[model samples]
Target: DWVPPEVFDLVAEDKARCMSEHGTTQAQIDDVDKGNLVNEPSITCYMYCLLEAFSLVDDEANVDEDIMLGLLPDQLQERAQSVMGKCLPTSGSDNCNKIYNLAKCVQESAPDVWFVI
Candidate 1:
């Protein structure tokens, strides 16, 4: 399983809203995996919205690694661990930077793992 059904359902409304508000199309996000594009602001915002919805990051966009790992399903944990290990932001980075780093890491290293929200 890519993600738990319950977790997917939990983020569905927020994902819709995030896409609508940020104009982050799935085509553009998919381009990241294709290695044709980088983390644009819209995509970063879209990612941040999902992180917040999952309570992986706070409203202020600071990541709580423990909370994030706790929320991940068993199937995703190992990948998440690897992604976070490589991409988790350091203190003082902006929200966009944090989102971009994580998004880029997943795009490059585990392209098949993320749900195409």
Candidate 2:
């Protein structure tokens, strides 16, 4: 099931894009090891990537919370909750809490830039 050749190329492309936009370090991309990249970069990564890439180009911007919510089907949400937990009261003690805090931070701090509807 391993697709090293294809996946590595995609990862490299992603690394380059991240670096160009945010001057991101390899450390950040490497946060997801090969296995992690393959299975669990988290749903946030794709959204973050879109925000970084094209969201800035348009004028009348909005976070399509409905569509965004649609992206994660209930089944996937349940699975994500099973694996990563919730996203409020972020505390290092609980993974779900950490995620909750992160979501809040994104919504509150950068509504225009990191809109999570």
TM-scores, all models, native as reference: 0.68, 0.31
Q: How many pairs collide in each candidate, listed in order?
A: 0, 5
**In candidate 1, how many Å is residue 30 off?**
4.0
Enumerate residue pairs that collide in model 1.
none
Clashes of 2: 5
Model 2 score (lDDT): 0.37
lDDT of 2 by residue, 1-117 (tens): 122355445456654665565444455344422212222224334324543343321222233343433444464444433322333223432332333345444444332222221
* lDDT per model vs. reference: 0.70, 0.37
